[PDB]
Design a protein around this ligand. Sequence first.
Ligand SMILES: NC(=O)c1cn([C@@H]2O[C@H](CO)[C@@H](O)[C@H]2O)c2ncnc(N)c12
Ligand SMILES: [K+]
Length: 538
Amino acid sequence: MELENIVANTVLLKAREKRKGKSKKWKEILKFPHISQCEDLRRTIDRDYCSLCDKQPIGRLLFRQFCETRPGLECYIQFLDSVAEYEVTPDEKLGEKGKEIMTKYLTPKSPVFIAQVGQDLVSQTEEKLLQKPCKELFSACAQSVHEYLRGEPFHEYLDSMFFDRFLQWKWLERQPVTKNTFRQYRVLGKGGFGEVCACQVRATGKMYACKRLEKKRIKKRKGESMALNEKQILEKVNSQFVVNLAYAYETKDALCLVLTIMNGGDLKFHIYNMGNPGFEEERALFYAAEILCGLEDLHRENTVYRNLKPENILLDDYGHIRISDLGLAVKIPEGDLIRGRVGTVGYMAPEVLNNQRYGLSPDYWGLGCLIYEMIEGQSPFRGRKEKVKREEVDRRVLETEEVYSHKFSEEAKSICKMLLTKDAKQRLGCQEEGAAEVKRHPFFRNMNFKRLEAGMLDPPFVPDPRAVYCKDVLDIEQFSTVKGVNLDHTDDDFYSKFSTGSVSIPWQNEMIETECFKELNVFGPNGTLPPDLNRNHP
Ligand SMILES: NC(=O)c1cn([C@@H]2O[C@H](CO)[C@@H](O)[C@H]2O)c2ncnc(N)c12
Ligand SMILES: [K+]
């Protein structure tokens, strides 16, 4: 056993767990400025209700805490809250939970009577509940409320100390990000132009994965657009099954993408480097469903992936999964196909192997590639440790068809072949239906996709918190360190465009999640102005 491996792993594990790993001077690092400093932010901030009072979490929570001051608004907040409950109550008890809300917000004498909805809608929605319940029953009601809260109540929040306080938080969000903000841990993987590392924000202690993009490697491979595209794309997609981007900065030697951290290890590892090859069909189904949901969301944004292999699918702490390394994805101009001989060997669709124009098709080819591999324990066109020169694998994918065993259930066998069809025209999901056509296949039977996309299905396999499901640090491949390249000032523009600092909404979640927002967001006694917000005197 190499100590270089033991140490690398035990260090990471301590961080993963006093102070939840925070730095010692976090209260000073994240100290609010005096409100007088936020005049540029007071002007530049765009005054949108959903953004400032909903989409941006801290804005949302400060508005709610502000609504708790006016009794006439705390009810609307509790109403939309109750609606949230009704919208996640089971179809079985939808009618009942529909009943408590109704007797609570709609009678003129209800204790939490809200009058701003409209006496017509209460009756329209009342008959709909007497008829039959639907989770989208109060959709119009909650909309009618949002029409009112966005009016007078919204501008009242903007005038109070709570929105003033939100400016202070946004001042922190704007703060520059540097290597200092984080501490680097063991390497988690090689890929693309750099390495993926565990790191931890010193101030907050939140764990992330730092996908490094080594500058010299970008210049040497003309992959400038490929690196940049990955960054924006990671930003544009906002999905439960895709790594979300939290920071993006520059260093003396690399550009960096700070992404959600996936401590369960990648699926390539769970298939070959743990227990018997592959895992039970139960496990394959759950993960395959989530991969589907991720691909449908990626395609909703009109974006292909082209890089689907187990090594780029990761497992989180609870057993859910997300897609990684979106550096091979491109957004498609609508009504056009692209020619690109890119991808990894044996995970390329026949169109991509023939340098033929394609659209969203090669993604469903990959979905089949993974499902077969999870259950069969090997690529559908390549062995386990099989040494094959690429030319043949290429041939096999185009000429030869896959082979199934008794391990495949009737449904598992079927969904593979329909996804592993050489003709892109007759490929499952590649029809106009899209990912819907796949959501049906009996393979995903008793797989309530609507309930999975919520997250109410427990993963079958739960990674143990005290396990690093990754190759040991000394077993991670390295590059042939690029040297003799010299970075010119011509690239400082791209470095600037790439390094956009923190991502607004994610940063706020970190402050909320790390309880930094909870501990810091306090006010004077009896709900009075603290000193940082009083511009009259100290
Ligand atoms: N941003 C990424 O792409 C990630 C890559 N790895 C690991 O590092 C390897 C190199 O990409 C992968 O196969 C995973 O084992 C990751 N592990 C956790 N979270 C992540 N976001 C990644
Ligand atoms: K296994």
